Write a structure and sequence with these properties.
part of a larger assembly; 4 chains; A mainly beta (271); B mainly alpha (46); C little secondary structure (22); D alpha+beta (93); A: 271 residues; mainly beta; OB fold (Dihydrolipoamide Acetyltransferase, E2P); Ribosomal protein L2, domain 3; seven-stranded antiparallel beta sheet; 1 helix; 2% helix; globular; C: 22 residues; little secondary structure; RNA-binding; ribosome/inhibitor; ribosome; antimicrobial protein
Amino acid sequence: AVVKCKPTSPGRRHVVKVVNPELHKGKPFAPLLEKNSKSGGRNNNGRITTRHIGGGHKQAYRIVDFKRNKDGIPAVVERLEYDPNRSANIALVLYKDGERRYILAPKGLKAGDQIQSGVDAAIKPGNTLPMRNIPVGSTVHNVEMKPGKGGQLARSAGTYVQIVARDGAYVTLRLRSGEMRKVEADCRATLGEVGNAEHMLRVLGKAGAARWRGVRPTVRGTAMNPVDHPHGGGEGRNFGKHPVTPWGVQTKGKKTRSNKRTDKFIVRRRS
Amino acid sequence: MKRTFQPSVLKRNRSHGFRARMATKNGRQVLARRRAKGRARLTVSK
Amino acid sequence: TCARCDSXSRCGAXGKXSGXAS
Amino acid sequence: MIREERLLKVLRAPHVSEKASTAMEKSNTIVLKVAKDATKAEIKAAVQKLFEVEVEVVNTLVVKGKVKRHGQRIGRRSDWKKAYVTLKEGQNL
RNA sequence: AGGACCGAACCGACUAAUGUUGAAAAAUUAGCGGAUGACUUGUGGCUGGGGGUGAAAGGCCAAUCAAACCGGGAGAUAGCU
RNA sequence: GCUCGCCGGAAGACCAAGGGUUCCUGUCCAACGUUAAUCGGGGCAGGGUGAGUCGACCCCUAAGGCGAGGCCGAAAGGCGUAGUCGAUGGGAAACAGGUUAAUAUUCCUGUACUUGGUGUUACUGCGAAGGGGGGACGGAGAAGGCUAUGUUGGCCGGGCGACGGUUGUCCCGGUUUAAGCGUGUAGGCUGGUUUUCCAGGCAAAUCCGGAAAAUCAAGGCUGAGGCGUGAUGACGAGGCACUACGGUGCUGAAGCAACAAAUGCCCUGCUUCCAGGAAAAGCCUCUAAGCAUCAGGUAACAUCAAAUCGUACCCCAAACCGACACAGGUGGUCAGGUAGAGAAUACCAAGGCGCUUGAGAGAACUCGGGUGAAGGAACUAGGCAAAAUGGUGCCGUAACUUCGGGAGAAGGCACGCUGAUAUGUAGGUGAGGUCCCUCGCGGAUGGAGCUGAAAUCAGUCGAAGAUACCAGCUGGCUGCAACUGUUUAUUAAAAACACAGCACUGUGCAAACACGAAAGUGGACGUAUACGGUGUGACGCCUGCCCGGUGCCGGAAGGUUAAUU
């Protein structure tokens, strides 16, 4: 669970770390690793397009299965592994033909559990089946949006999507944000919550803990000059504007959804 | 103190050398002006 | 040349240093 | 490695520079001046087909031209190529 | 164990004095801060001017920066000297 | 040439970068050298850089670059797939001695090693751009084994002292030796082997992975260093004849041990932590197309080949960057003695220097220091600057506190040399001898020799024993900022910026947003416990009332309202 740090120095006084002793204390599975070089927030023009990104620890990418193509073939979990690419943990599972794959680790899953994908699997956490074969009212995760595309909804550390209705070729989903959303019923999804529900309980304690995740410091706009940010200068602390982005678009209340081709999919917006 | 010019032959030839000027339209126009002026050295290159 | 040397002129003498490169 | 026109174009000059004489009487090494593109095989083939002697090995170095000046003008001598040809035991020169 | 303590290399620059046609177009001497980290450094690479980059001072972008430098418009214009 | 002085974690030695003949020798002193110059990094001329193993070139890739086609853009052009480049990384092999005025892992002597082409005897299943394994990797810490290296003893050579003494338990010097080859050790990883099947590895596969029986417990990989050979050699303190003073042809003694010991090696190990730690080839292994007494591979030996470029010299500097023979700047490696915790510091060794104007005199004043009666901050904007404190062990230590701190609070005691406990103790290392053995780089018993802290008692010297160098001033009240950090390169280091935390707001993914005429890329190979923006700034207690103004969100009734007709 979460453990306090004793304040033997400033910068340890407020640290809370999430300890999971059942994670694998060894090197990851080398056939499922690739290279993952940092961008620093730079695109192919070499420009900072997203601010406050850069530095941080080296990472290797873990190829996690989101599609879950291996229908019918049973799989046993070998072990839970730490993944630096996401807020959840992952699970090296072992199929019965000798193929090893990483998946998202759900809530109660440990080493030795039986998982199975496909159309006629069981109903237990870890199994992946289409949403036209699931009892209406259950909490799901790793939810696809197109049939075959790969799971995109509820991938985080402790999130879940609850199926609330079925009509036509569609099921209605109460997303984790508070939004009712119609998805097709050929889209696969995986039972149970994804399992790292104490991830939000950590407090980083110090500035270097944010710096070794690749988060550079954020300068307030009101600390800048008028040429730099619309929140300008002034003698002393003056604000005197309405709060906007660095590009003059009004923040703190102004909606920015303009898509108009996915309005046939949204029953109710979030709150 | 530490000065402006810290020389390096690889960076000099990758920045101002002949293949770098010939690689683009504008460096070829620079070499065209340096031939129209009568310069003995088009680029640095040595 | 370029050392500056006055509090504020374009070029005077002065033993200070923000005004002064001839 | 060999054709006779190239072998007649390889060698230029016997080199006499008071390390050449020490190398002749100490290490059985004659010191020659060769062309700027002559490889070791061409020098060895030219020494055997042109001096009638038999060669252990050929070592080569490139001598870099020295700068000599007059006023605002600076000239440079040519680069040349020195060879150390080691004979087996017997020799004429 | 620790953005832990003291302290050399190393990275900085808090105070004083010297120097100010300097040994130096920003240093020297004596003390001084950090010194396992948000550290520092070699080498290569990318971002280009109303643009970049900025733990943000309008700071830095080749001793130049409230808009670099070079060439051109160009013999701009100047009721001013 | 002899004395003196300075550096000695550098002001010594070797390189990379950069420079480009400054290297060595002869000759010259007009100009250059902040003086003179016979000298020189200066003029003139000549000489000097030798490689299958070192580096480059080469094979392979990272960030990134170019990019057939392709997509997009008035044009120029942009982005990108296949590819092809791109080291700062991965990949074959050589050391020791000597020698030139100037080159050396390159030349010579001795001893080696690696990879290709081709030839001969045999064993035969060979084949790639594809499959698999490996290459292949983080921070920190701790222990063990060593070695470089040093010290002492033994031995060998030389010395018996310009002035009291020096045949002694005295003085000075030397006591060095590599790669390769064999051994496979201290350790570290690992459970091996056979047979049968398979929805996995783009197709296949004897390979990898999975599953199941049978058998067995020693099998394989890795790995410092030690030892033997290498070595009947080389080097080596000193001597034989000579000399053109600078040495060369010549032999050449001992060349042993024990202890201490790295930041180096085993070690890319082991443990532990979260922040979860390159790629691809060489290498091994498996087959598709193709060929099967041929071709191809494998074990052994012979034979040929290993090209081309760099190599001088400087390289914390008078040779690079700074206009200068400029108190500046500049990455890596080597890292001795005594005292010390130490790469601090002090004195020294090897080695290198005395910094390219001197000679005097000994005014004011300026700079850098030393000391100072009595008073002791009276100075001044202000204790600025100086003075002062300063080390190890031990005793002791307040308010407050977030229970960690405060704290090295404050404050104080001992400290040198000699003798004894003990001809040198506890501890550390560890020979000879006895026995056992899966028989060696072993295990017990052992304890010599070597090294050696701190303590206690007594004595004794001085004014002073942390004697030099080195080396905290301390306490009390209070503002701001929680803190470590960051910042106006060159007048401002701060109460500013950041910060962990908190909140509000947007964002349902082909996301919001950003860069871009666009294609597209970042966000992100992430998915609302995530991401972008904005404000406040740890933590404790809290965060009140106002929606009339402006903004934002919601609503659609009515009015007003553009292009169009």
